[PDB]
């Protein structure tokens, strides 16, 4: 049915890969339980040699998974990157979710245990089995309306880039980018889910290998870290492809004969000269070709078909002749310059709802009611709460109420409420499984 | 395999129809051959019994031949090509190729008394009736072609609907503009680009059921008329103007996030923010509650229909029936979301359209086509404004052919198997 249907066109050839969005698409999370005693002691020793808001969990991951089930049902697999911690409610019997530890993705184990989200984020593209294009969600980011892959990518325009107006980390990265790509004024990607291409990310990190190693080596956040989204999206937007002159030729050689006719030459002429095209512009190009055929070796200039030229001195204008004629290829490189290696589409921030949650209750109710009234595709409720403040518990309740109003149905990734995982850490679970199944 | 791949997701359900562009997509051309001596005689007689319909209306300058070559090169995903004519067939058309067919005016016109016709607007009122035509099809005038690779997303996306290519700005439009202003309210409108037009057959019929008199009148004009429903202008402004009323039942379902059929206090609050300006006052919430309470006592028990535990013990189970038939609530919902667009659409610029009016000054035509040579465009229209009696008209036709051959020199699957002094003056 569908195999035949996609070949049912004048070309008799399938274009499904261009007519359909790229699949599969996995999701990657990072999650941490700040209440874990092993973490608190290990963090304590490190500092002895980062407030509770960085590691605190308001059940954000639980409800974000509910939002995927409701608003992104097309996701293939969900990877939850942790330091070894396991959420008590996570249903590990569901093959659609798995836990990935820092040990599994970090390259230098000396960087662990870590407590720096930038360091972790340098390695999440290394997850074995990860789809080439995946979407990274912070645990406190979730979907507020139905989303589809074209909210992140299209074949015609590439990845969407959601930029916003603005950090010492940006100065450091801006300096790197200025030196690599020249200067540009750079806005900041929104606090939202980010689609990442594993190959582009690796190409980026191969460009700045020492910097990403440095960022990974920082066990706490640091001013000279490679900002995950900022680094990726500006590498994607700034990577340059060098003009392929042989491909310029094949475009002009519309009968695929290997030789440029007079009418094909005119098109080349119009593309290295300002319009209107003068007779001097045209004859100059012709003279360049004739001078080049004489000067160049006959081996490089290389009759299946017979081309007749207005100028009886014009030799067969072959690809070889054009490739190695510097006067022409210079004007070509001058007339077309700086081709982006990747396509991308700048987006506004209309579909992002980013809220800094503090402890002023009246204000928090107002922020969440704005999302109730005005649904948004991308929601980020960032923790800036002060728990010592008396109104802290009230705020936490208002948040739970908002979350429950949007996503009241438990997901296939939640254990039943009466059950919980026996072990809080992956190493303990690995040991129990081996003891049980032992002979 | 691929079948297995589209269910490989957390829902275990296939979303192929949303993840893939809509297919199939056919192409429709109209074509006329003005050199046909029977056509010439008939047109002359029609004019006399009644200028504005010169040879430029009907002259084949090889446009169709080269446009078909541009489909083979730039739109290989098209399923079928229908060529609509008055019975004429290009001598070179390979009808043994099942990917192309000829459709006559007789096959699609409703009133046969309107034929024979010589009016493109009249013909265009019926091309959506082609038997077997894909629901979404792309209509090309013969003098329109593709100049770069195009894909269906150049015309339509699931997320944003049909693309509408508008240009800063005729008597025909004044007539349609008045009709639209009366139907939808007054607005100043821009004109769609001269380009291939994607048309949805169901929306076209809905449009023609909204102005049945005017489309029958357009169909009945055997030559172009000041009071024609201009094809693209009528279609795209109907698409952008049709309004739909909000479906309260669907609002309720979005609010009822646990799908329990009853609105909890938590879900009611969301409803309250949607019909009120923030910040939300206690009075806003209580008044909404009182409307439901007032509505429950008043509505028939048959309409009102784990039990819900409400803050106010007086609250009834807020069922869909209670909300839908509560006039004070439904009217306040409609006041808060009024005149929703019935169709999705995306406004586009004219960066990808190259529209050239071809006259009889050879050097100026060369300049116009050089701009396309240098600056490729997805959509090209070379419009006939040639004085075909002029001596230089033959030279201009040769300039066009030379330009056409520089872009598409390869005969297409739709063509049947099988100057220097003019070059000097045009170019040297
Ligand atoms: C738009 O409309 C116009 C007008 O209706 C069409 O013009 C006709 O085009 C056809 C071609 O399809 C013409 O027919 C051809 O004429 C050529 C010249 O004929 C003269 O010389 C021959 C002797 O060689 C005499 O017999 C003849 O009477 C003329 O004095 C012929 O050389 C062609 O012959 C070839 O085609 C035939 C038919 O298939 C073969 O059998 C032959 O073996 C040979 O291969 C052919 O006869 C016709 O004269 C034109 N009519 C008019 C009134 O001008 C356009 O074709 C049409 N455009 C499109 C795109 O369809
Ligand atoms: C985040 O980490 C905290 C701390 O590890 C988790 O809370 C802890 O949950 C465990 C359950 O395995 C509690 O241990 C249990 O205690 C009871 C009573 O003492 C005992 O009967 C059990 O045998 C078991 O030892 C532990 O007390 C509790 N600690 C705190 C501070 O609450 C929490 O569940 C983690 N969150 C997530 C989402 O995983
Ligand atoms: C949406 C967004 O743009 N978020 C960015 C923001 O996060 P932000 O500054 O909001 O910091 P968060 O507290 O949300 O932590 C970032 C992410 O890292 C996870 N985490 C954090 C600490 C830890 O030890 N383990 C762990 O897994 C958190 O669960 C969260 O998923 O600034 C960080 C610093 O540049 C970036 O890394 C985050 O990408
Ligand atoms: C690209 C575009 O927006 N074109 C519009 C423009 O075209 P325009 O004014 O340029 O009209 P054209 O002369 O190109 O004719 C339009 C189409 O009708 C065909 N034709 C014409 C006469 C005839 O007797 N038989 C026949 O089949 C021509 O082949 C051509 O395919 O204004 C016309 C008048 O509103 C509209 O109808 C055309 O849709
Ligand atoms: C893997 O990392 C170790 C450790 O690097 C140091 O410790 C990190 C936590 C962080 O603070 C880094 O900036 C540190 O450099 C590397 O071994 C270190 O190598 C440097 C340079 O030779 C030396 O000065 C340190 O003393 C070394 N530290 C230790 C503990 O050996 C090691 O080279 C890294 N592996 C690779 C392949 O590069
Ligand atoms: C189909 O059309 C005929 C007549 O169309 C006429 O010719 C066209 C070219 C154009 O000039 C039209 O304006 C003409 O009307 C309809 O028959 C006409 O009906 C009206 C009112 O019933 C009458 O005033 C005319 O004299 C009639 N003309 C003729 C020639 O019969 C006919 O009703 C149409 N068919 C349908 C189903 O509506
Ligand atoms: C709710 O109803 C209150 C009472 O209205 C009076 O009594 C009821 C039983 C009906 O018969 C009605 O026609 C009478 O006028 C009103 O005072 C109150 O304003 C109403 N509130 C809302 C929000 O509708
Ligand atoms: C340039 O394109 C040709 C195809 O026309 C390809 O064979 C060649 O490898 C390309 N060169 C580079 C450097 O990419
Ligand atoms: C909460 O924030 C609003 C807006 O900034 C302010 O007017 C109000 O006084 C604040 N309330 C408290 C208790 O801080
Ligand atoms: C309103 O929505 C319901 C489903 O929620 C649907 O069954 C019904 O047909 C819709 N009504 C109209 C008039 O579209
Ligand atoms: C064509 O137009 C140019 C103006 O650009 C003019 O100089 C020239 O004389 C015109 N040629 C004819 C034949 O009218
Ligand atoms: Ca060639
Ligand atoms: Ca409910
Ligand atoms: Mg947090
Ligand atoms: Mg955060
Ligand atoms: Mg024409
Ligand atoms: Mg035209």
SS (H, E, C) chain A: CHHHHHCCCCCCCCCHHHHECCCCCEEEEECCCCCCHHHHHHHHHHHHCCCCCCCCCCCHHHHHHHHHHHHCCCCCCEEEEECCECCCCECCCCCCEEEEEHHHHCCCHHHCCCCCHHHHHCCHHHCCCCCCEEEEEECCEEECCCCCHHHCEECCCEEEEEEECCCHHHHHHHHHHHHHHCCCCCCEECCCCEEEEHHHHHHHHHHCHHHHHHHHHCCCCCCCCCCHHHHHHHHHHHCEECCCHHHHHHHHCCCCCCECCHHHHHHHHHHHCCCCCCHHHHHHHHHHHHHHHHHCCHHHHCCCCCCCCCCCCCCCCEHHHHHCCHHHHHHHHHHCCCEECCCEEEECCCCEEEEEECCCHHHHHHHHHHHHHCCCCEEEEEECCCCCCCCHHHHHHHHHHHHHHHCCCCCCCECCCCCCCCCCEHHHHHHHHHHHCCC
Any binding-site annotation on A60?
Answer: no
- Indicate yes or no: CB of B5 within 8 angstroms of CB of A24: yes
Residue A180 included in any domain: yes
Asked if the C-beta of A412 comes within 8 angstroms of chain B's C-beta atoms, the answer is yes
Cis peptide before A24 (omega within 30 of 0): yes
Are B331 and B255 in contact by the 8 Å Cβ rule? The answer is no
Relative orientation angle of helices A245-252 and A326-335, to the nearest 10 degrees: 90
Q: How far apart are the first and last CA of chain A?
A: 51
Strand partners, A136: A28, A194
The CA-CA-CA angle for residues B392, B91, B383, to 5°, reads: 40
Same domain (yes/no): B329, B372: no
Burial class (CB in 10 A: 0-12, 13-18, 19+), B124: buried
Are B26 and B139 in contact by the 8 Å Cβ rule? The answer is no
Experimental determination technique: X-ray
**How many Å lie between the centroid of ligand 12 and the Cα of residue A10?**
24
Are B426 and B399 in contact by the 8 Å Cβ rule? The answer is yes
Of B332, B310, B330, B306, the closest CA to residue B320 belongs to B330
Give CA–CA dist A265/B406, Å, rounded.
9
CB environment A46-61: b (16+ within 10 A), e (fewer)? eeeeeeeeebbbbebb
Of B94, B167, B205, the closest CA to residue B347 belongs to B167
Tokens of B258: 């646990």
For residue A376, the number of C-alpha atoms closer than 13 Å in the C-beta half-sphere is 23
Asked if the C-beta of B402 comes within 8 angstroms of chain A's C-beta atoms, the answer is yes
**Among the partner residues A19, A404, A408, nearest to B21 by beta-carbon distance:** A19
Of B338, B342, B346, B386, the closest CA to residue B362 belongs to B386
Residue A118 included in any domain: yes
From chain A, the residues in CB contact with B23 under 8 A are 5-6, 19
Same domain (yes/no): B56, B140: yes
Give CA–CA dist B426/B257, Å, rounded.
71
Give CA–CA dist A142/B269, Å, rounded.
21
Give CA–CA dist B402/B63, Å, rounded.
12
Answer left, alpha or beta for residue A174, where phi above 0 means left and psi between -120 and 50 means alpha: alpha
Choose one of B283, B316, B341: the last residue of a domain.
B341
Q: What are phi and psi of A263, to 5 degrees?
A: -70, -30
Are B346 and B163 in contact by the 8 Å Cβ rule? The answer is yes
> Can you give the resolution of this entry in Å?
2.3
Q: Which ligand is nearest to the CA of B110?
A: 6
Strand partners, B81: B27, B100
Asked if the C-beta of A98 comes within 8 angstroms of chain B's C-beta atoms, the answer is no
- Total count of residues recorded for chain B: 428
Cis peptide before A265 (omega within 30 of 0): no
The residue in chain A having the minimum alpha-carbon distance to the alpha carbon of residue B423 is: A310
Of A83, A86, A119, the closest CA to residue A102 belongs to A83
Pocket test of ligand 4: the residue of B55, B103, B120, B199 to mutate, having most ligand atoms within 8 Å of its CB, is: B120
The residue in chain B having the minimum alpha-carbon distance to the alpha carbon of residue A408 is: B258
The alpha carbon torsion through A82, A88, A93, A97 (nearest 10 deg) reads: -40
Q: CB within 6 Å of ligand 10 — which residues?
A: B 247, 249-250, 253
> What is the gyration radius of the CA atoms in chain A, in angstroms?
29
From B83's Cα to the closest Cα of chain A, the distance in A is 15
Same domain (yes/no): A403, A309: no
Residue A7 included in any domain: no
Cis peptide before A179 (omega within 30 of 0): no
Q: Is B114 a pocket residue for ligand 6 (Cβ < 6 Å)?
A: yes
- Total count of residues recorded for chain A: 439
Q: What are phi and psi of B263, to 5 degrees?
A: -90, 120
Domain housing A251: 245-338
Contacts of residue A334, defined as CB under 8 A and 6 or more positions apart, other chains included, come to A272
Of A136, A118, A132, A138, the closest CA to residue A57 belongs to A138
Contacts of residue A297, defined as CB under 8 A and 6 or more positions apart, other chains included, come to none
**Among the partner residues A20, A69, A407, nearest to B20 by beta-carbon distance:** A20
Q: Give the neighbor-by-neighbor strand order of the sheet with A133-138.
A: A97-101, A78-82, A26-30, A133-138, A194-197
Same domain (yes/no): B55, B168: yes
Give CA–CA dist B92/B87, Å, rounded.
15
Atom of ligand 3 nearest to the CA of A139: 31
Give CA–CA dist A124/A99, Å, rounded.
12
The residue in chain B having the minimum alpha-carbon distance to the alpha carbon of residue A70 is: B11
Of A419, A437, A436, A432, the closest CA to residue A87 belongs to A419
Answer left, alpha or beta for residue A338, where phi above 0 means left and psi between -120 and 50 means alpha: left
CATH number at residue B141: 3.90.550.10
Distance, C-alpha A416 to centroid of its chain? 35
Residue A358 included in any domain: yes
* Residue A151: Cβ within 10 Å count: 22
Give CA–CA dist B146/B196, Å, rounded.
8
Give CA–CA dist B388/B272, Å, rounded.
69
Tokens of A146: 């139905």
Q: Is A362 a pocket residue for ligand 9 (Cβ < 6 Å)?
A: yes
Task: Say which residue the tokens 């049902």 belong to.
Answer: A73
Going from the C-alpha of B250 to that of each of B247, B259, B324, the distances in angstroms are 5, 12, 10
- Residue ranges of the annotated binding site of B are 256, 258, 260, 267
Residue A414 included in any domain: yes
From B408's Cα to the closest Cα of chain A, the distance in A is 7
The residue in chain A having the minimum alpha-carbon distance to the alpha carbon of residue B420 is: A310
Same domain (yes/no): B238, B300: no
Pocket test of ligand 6: the residue of B42, B46, B109, B113 to mutate, having most ligand atoms within 8 Å of its CB, is: B113
Are A136 and A198 in contact by the 8 Å Cβ rule? The answer is no
Q: A158-164 and A141-143: which strand pairing? A: unpaired
Same domain (yes/no): B123, B59: yes
* Residue B78: Cβ within 10 Å count: 22
Breaks in chain A, after residue numbers (C to N greater than 2.5 Å): 49, 166, 302
Residue B273 included in any domain: yes
Of A258, A240, A241, the closest CA to residue A249 belongs to A258
Same domain (yes/no): A385, A299: no
Give CA–CA dist A353/A372, Å, rounded.
11
Of A347, A297, A303, the closest CA to residue A324 belongs to A297
Same domain (yes/no): A292, A376: no
Of A395, A419, A432, A413, the closest CA to residue A58 belongs to A395
- Indicate yes or no: CB of B9 within 8 angstroms of CB of A75: yes
Same domain (yes/no): A369, A301: no
Choose one of A316, A338, A360: the last residue of a domain.
A338
Give CA–CA dist B135/B150, Å, rounded.
19
Tokens of B394: 């033959």
From A78's Cα to the closest Cα of chain B, the distance in A is 9
Give CA–CA dist B177/B189, Å, rounded.
8
* Per-residue three-class SS string for chain B: CHHHHHCCCCCCCCCHHHHECCCCCEEEEECCCCCCHHHHHHHHHHHHHCCCCCHHHCCCCCHHHHHHHHHHHHCCCCCCEEEEECCCCCCCECCCCCCEEEEEHHHHCCCHHHCCCCCHHHHHCCHHHCCCCCCEEEEEECCEEECCCCCHHHCEECCCEEEEEEECCCHHHHHHHHHHHHHHCCCCCCEECCCCEEEEHHHHHHHHHHCHHHHHHHHHCCCCCCCCCCHHHHHHHHHHHCEECCCHHHHHHHHCCCCCCECCHHHHHHHHHHCCCCCCCHHHHHHHHHHHHHHHHHCCHHHHCCCCCCCCCCCCCCEHHHHHCCHHHHHHHHHHCCCEECCCEEEECCCCEEEEEECCCHHHHHHHHHHHHHCCCCEEEEEECCCCCCCCHHHHHHHHHHHHHHHCCCCCCCECCCCHHHHHHHHC
Cis peptide before A113 (omega within 30 of 0): yes
Task: Say which residue the tokens 């709460």 belong to.
Answer: A385
Tokens of A357: 């949650």
Residue B214 included in any domain: yes
Contacts of residue A291, defined as CB under 8 A and 6 or more positions apart, other chains included, come to A327
Same domain (yes/no): B284, B421: no
Q: Which ligand is nearest to the CA of B62?
A: 1
Going from the C-alpha of B241 to that of each of A260, B154, B170, the distances in angstroms are 50, 21, 21
Q: How many domains does chain B have?
A: 2
Same domain (yes/no): A206, A106: yes
Are A414 and A65 in contact by the 8 Å Cβ rule? The answer is yes
Cis peptide before A276 (omega within 30 of 0): yes
Residue B379 included in any domain: yes
From B341's Cα to the closest Cα of chain A, the distance in A is 18
Q: Number of CB pairs < 8 Å for A and B?
A: 156
Q: How far apart are the first and last CA of chain B?
A: 60
Are A78 and A29 in contact by the 8 Å Cβ rule? The answer is yes
The CA-CA-CA angle for residues A311, A312, A314, to 5°, reads: 70
Nearest residue by C-alpha to atom 2 in ligand 7: B294
Contacts of residue B59, defined as CB under 8 A and 6 or more positions apart, other chains included, come to B34, B35, B384, B386, B388
Choose one of B297, B312, B341: the last residue of a domain.
B341
CB environment A397-411: b (16+ within 10 A), e (fewer)? ebbeebbbbbbbebb
Same domain (yes/no): B278, B352: no
Contacts of residue B227, defined as CB under 8 A and 6 or more positions apart, other chains included, come to B172, B175, B214, B217, B218, B221
**How many Å lie between the centroid of ligand 12 and the Cα of residue A315?**
13
The residue in chain B having the minimum alpha-carbon distance to the alpha carbon of residue A97 is: B10
Burial class (CB in 10 A: 0-12, 13-18, 19+), A290: middle
Q: CB within 6 Å of ligand 8 — which residues?
A: A 244, 246-247, 250
> What is the gyration radius of the CA atoms in chain B, in angstroms?
28
Are A424 and A86 in contact by the 8 Å Cβ rule? The answer is yes
Give CA–CA dist B284/B277, Å, rounded.
9
Relative orientation angle of helices B327-336 and B282-298, to the nearest 10 degrees: 130
Task: Tell me which residues of chain B, numbers 260 to 279, contact chain A at a CB-CB cutoff of 8 Å.
Answer: 266-267, 269-270, 273-274, 278-279
Task: Say which residue the tokens 């949607």 belong to.
Answer: B274
Are A73 and B11 in contact by the 8 Å Cβ rule? The answer is yes
């Amino acid at each position: 049915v569908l195999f035949d249907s996609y070949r049912d066109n004048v070309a008799g050839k399938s274009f499904q890969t261009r007519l359909c969005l790229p699949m599969p698409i996995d999701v990657v999370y990072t999650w941490v339980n700040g209440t874990d005693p092993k973490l608190i002691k290990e963090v304590t020793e490190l500092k002895r040699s980062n407030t509770a808001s960085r590691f605190e969990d308001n059940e954000e991951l639980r409800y974000s998974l509910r939002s995927i089930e409701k608003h992104a049902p097309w996701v293939r697999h969900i990877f939850i990157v942790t330091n070894g911690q396991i959420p008590s409610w996570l249903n590990l019997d569901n093959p659609r979710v798995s836990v990935v530890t820092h040990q599994d993705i970090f390259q230098n184990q000396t960087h662990l245990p870590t407590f720096s989200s930038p360091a972790i984020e340098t390695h999440i593209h290394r997850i074995p089995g990860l789809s080439q294009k995946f979407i990274y969600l912070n645990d406190d980011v979730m979907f507020g309306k139905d989303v589809w892959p074209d909210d992140f990518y299209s074949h015609s325009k590439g990845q969407k880039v959601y930029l916003t107006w603005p950090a010492d980390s940006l100065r450091y990265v801006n300096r790197l980018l200025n030196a690599q790509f020249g200067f540009t004024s750079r806005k900041v990607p929104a606090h939202m889910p980010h689609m990442i291409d594993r190959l582009i990310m690796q190409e980026l990190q191969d460009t700045f290998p020492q910097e990403f190693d440095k960022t990974s080596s920082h066990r706490v956040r640091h001013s000279e870290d490679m900002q995950f989204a900022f680094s990726y999206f500006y590498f994607l937007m700034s990577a340059v492809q060098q003009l392929n002159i042989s491909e310029v030729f094949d475009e002009i050689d519309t009968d695929h004969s290997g030789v440029l006719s007079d009418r094909e030459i005119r098109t080349l002429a119009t593309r290295i000269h300002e319009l209107p095209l003068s007779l001097q512009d045209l004859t100059s190009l012709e003279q360049m070709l004739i001078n080049c055929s004489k000067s160049l070796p006959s081996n490089l200039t290389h009759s299946p078909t017979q081309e007749a030229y207005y100028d009886p001195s014009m030799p067969p204008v072959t690809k070889g002749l054009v490739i190695h004629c510097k006067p022409i290829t210079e004007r070509i490189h001058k007339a077309f310059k700086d081709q982006n290696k990747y396509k991308f589409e700048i987006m506004g921030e209309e579909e992002i709802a980013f809220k800094m949650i503090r402890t002023n209750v009246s204000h928090v109710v107002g922020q969440l009611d704005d999302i109730r009234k005005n649904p948004r595709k991308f929601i980020c409720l960032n923790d800036n709460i002060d728990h010592i403040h008396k109104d802290a518990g009230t705020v936490k309740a208002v948040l739970r109420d908002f979350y429950e109003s949007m996503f009241p149905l438990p997901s296939q990734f939640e254990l039943p409420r009466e059950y919980r995982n026996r072990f809080l850490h992956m190493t303990e679970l690995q040991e129990w499984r081996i003891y049980r199944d032992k002979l």
